[PDB]
Ligand binder design. Sequence first.
Ligand SMILES: [Mg+2]
Length: 290
Amino acid sequence: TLRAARPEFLDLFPAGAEARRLADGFTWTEGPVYVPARSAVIFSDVRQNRTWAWSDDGQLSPEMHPSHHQNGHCLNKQGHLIACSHGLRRLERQREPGGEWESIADSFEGKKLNSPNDVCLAPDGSLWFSDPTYGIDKPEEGYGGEMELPGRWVFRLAPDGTLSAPIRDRVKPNGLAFLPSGNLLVSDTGDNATHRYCLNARGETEYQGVHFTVEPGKTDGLRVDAGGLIWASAGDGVHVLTPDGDELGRVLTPQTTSNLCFGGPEGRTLYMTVSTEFWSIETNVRGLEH
Ligand SMILES: [Mg+2]
């Protein structure tokens, strides 16, 4: 259900729009992305080592088992499915349904990655991913392992194959979302705040400061819509913020929401990974595209 902090919040949803559960029986849902070619949202259950598909015709189907504790997902420029893998400690790509998984980033300067958590596509085609240590710290969320890197970074995987780590000042970087300006937002689940960086072109960043915090809980995954509004996970649902970080309202969920994505047959459905369940609400807006 909807709780407006400002009137214009209601403009964002069709009349009588309500958050509703789509599916249950999961342990910890995460990492949803809509794949138009498959007419389905793919999402992970991180704590059950599997991924699922929710089709536009309203069917839940198993996607991958084991998934090697895949977590976050996005599409690359070509619309290939991109996964963050806790278990394999890598970023990986799937070209086609049922197709083999290809590693696209599995080490940095002779060191293993920690455990990629979330990923997003940059306007220049680069794939940016957060590398906190949840995937190797929590045995329920991966295959174990020890940290090899100096810290928990945000990586940029250039379309040509060049891997860099331009963001090294975060505690546990987690959710990532680009803004219409082409600058980047980074949620930090150690800092418990969402942070803003300017991208000085081509994989070089400058920290701008804390963009916002949320209560109750904290922002894990987040997305930005076509108008630049920020759709941010929290303890009680999704908080919708102005581009400057001011709260318009919230979509309330009975448990914590970890992540979210725009999709559906019109691109206007907001899917939410809500702990043990998977939820959606109809909106009047689409995800940002570039
Ligand atoms: Mg996450």
